Amino acid sequence: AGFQLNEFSSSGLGRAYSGEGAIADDAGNVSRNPALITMFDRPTFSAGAVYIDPDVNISGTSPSGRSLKADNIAPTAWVPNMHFVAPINDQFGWGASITSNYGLATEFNDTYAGGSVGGTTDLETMNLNLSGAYRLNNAWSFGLGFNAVYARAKIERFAGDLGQLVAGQIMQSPAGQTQQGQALAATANGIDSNTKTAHLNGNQWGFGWNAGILYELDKNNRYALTYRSEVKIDFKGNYLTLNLPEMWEVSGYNRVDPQWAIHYSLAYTSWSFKDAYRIALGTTYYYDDNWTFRTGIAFRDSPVPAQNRSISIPDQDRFWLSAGTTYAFNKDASVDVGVSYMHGQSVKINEGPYQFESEGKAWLFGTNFNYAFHHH
Ligand SMILES: CCCCCCCCOCCOCCOCCOCCO
Ligand SMILES: CCCCCCCCOCCOCCOCCOCCO
Ligand SMILES: CCCCCCCCOCCOCCOCCOCCO
């Protein structure tokens, strides 16, 4: 957040989401690349959730003299996931998942000076996916997926100190000399910071598709190109379209040893004019039959000026640092747990009449349970 999320699995969390289009140790990855369906030879289920605990802080002084300070403006969150994939044939398979690829939340007191650009911003999203895949031969697979997205938005803004700003401007102008001018300033200054200035509530569905190609040099090495379509969501509440952006991703996975694999990816996102990319690299330690270990790093760059930035929507250049571990109870069942630390960069924000600074980070903790059907 983002507002884009990667938290589709706890195993992925532990590898900082690196080459997620090319690994297939559990069912979570089919949501990332429907072509991976052909790596599964038996019905496979997975479920869990990621707990996100952000710490995002705003600082600054308004030209009115009011503090623009705001501690801890991003609340914690639970992001659940469920996945299922199952072969139909030696060539065909299918899968289904419930995920969220998008969400954000910021809240300021309704008494905050910068209220007109920072009150309450709440977007929750749920992706429903059905996928199919076709294996052409030993090397090549293709996957196609259909997405139903449910989105719940809540916005409120407030006057903040706007009326104090207007009072300032009026008093400064020649009109500050007149009696009508003073009165008009006083009327503006007298507007409560907590005056509700805006309010939106909406819940809507949108639809999209996604596709993927898998190339396997052999059972230890593979590469993938994936594409997620944009999804548009028209809230008839009150325009008013919310645009979930395209994503392209290239992934690679190298099992360079019975005990070691690496996995990396480049992912690209453009929207609207303003794009972003993410690179990620990680390694997996297949210690033994019971224990697997997991570590990764990532970096995301969306170079957005500063007068295009929002305090209500934090989007900085960020780093991920992750470790994880999978314990398998047997050849059928396992549990993943992931941890990640997410670090933003202190950034300047010039929005409306205000100048802020913003710095954020987050701790992530995830657990998934995996189960494959038809012993063993
Ligand atoms: C590349 C072709 C696949 C693209 C189609 C996308 C939607 C496919 O979803 C179909 C899922 O339906 C599940 C069928 O249930 C299995 C029935 O047969 C199982 C026998 O083993
Ligand atoms: C009977 C005359 C009494 C004068 C009261 C007029 C209204 C006083 O409120 C003024 C509020 O303006 C705040 C000043 O803002 C800081 C100055 O710099 C801001 C430039 O706009
Ligand atoms: C548009 C192609 C971009 C390729 C990037 C990833 C390729 C990784 O595989 C390279 C090694 O594979 C050996 C080549 O295999 C023989 C020809 O088939 C390769 C087509 O991908």
UniProtKB/Swiss-Prot annotation:
Gene3D superfamilies: Outer membrane protein transport protein (OMPP1/FadL/TodX). It is found in: Cell outer membrane. Induction: By long-chain fatty acids. Expression of fadL is under the control of the FadR repressor. GO terms for molecular function: ligand-gated channel activity; long-chain fatty acid transporting porin activity. InterPro entries: OMPP1/FadL/TodX. Pfam families: Toluene_X. One of its GO terms (cellular component) is cell outer membrane. It is a multi-pass membrane protein. It comes from the Bacteria. Keywords: Cell outer membrane, Lipid transport, Membrane, Signal, Transmembrane, Transmembrane beta strand, Transport. The keyword Membrane applies. Coiled coil: none annotated. GO terms for biological process: long-chain fatty acid transport. Involved in translocation of long-chain fatty acids across the outer membrane. It is a receptor for the bacteriophage T2. FadL may form a specific channel. Belongs to the OmpP1/FadL family. Has been isolated from outer membrane preparation as a homodimer. This is Long-chain fatty acid transport protein. It comes from Escherichia coli (strain K12). The lineage of its organism: Bacteria, Pseudomonadati, Pseudomonadota, Gammaproteobacteria, Enterobacterales.
